[PDB]
Amino acid sequence: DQLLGVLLEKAPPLSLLSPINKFQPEGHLNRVARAALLSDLKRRVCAD
Amino acid sequence: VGDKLVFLEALERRVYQATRVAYPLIGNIDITFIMPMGVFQANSMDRY
Amino acid sequence: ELAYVRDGVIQFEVQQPMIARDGPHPVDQPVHNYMVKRIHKRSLSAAF
């Protein structure tokens, strides 16, 4: 059941990331905006 | 409940018998700690 | 009639089947266990 764990291995963290990709229609932002979004995501993950 | 209807059954008491194999889907966090020496008072602000 | 009958025997069985669907447990070897039955006698006393 788990000896051949090729198909039974999928743990993508998306619960805290789904809104951040749903809000953006395209996501083509600048470097400052990308860095701010990354810092906000890191802070949210730390304070979860 | 609410507006959702998802099948839910007690598979813990029927699969793995709760005593044969370890429970799957177990995470791990590898964090590290740093302890800086610190800094001293500039001229006076060290006590009250 | 149980007074004239001594201690009997118990029915214990073990199974060593194959292994084909579960978590990745380490490979082991079939082993057997030995058990004994030691029951003492306890009784109080009374008099008039």
Automatic annotation (TrEMBL), chain A:
What name has this protein been given in UniProt?
ORF40
Top-level taxonomy: Viruses, Duplodnaviria, Heunggongvirae, Peploviricota, Herviviricetes
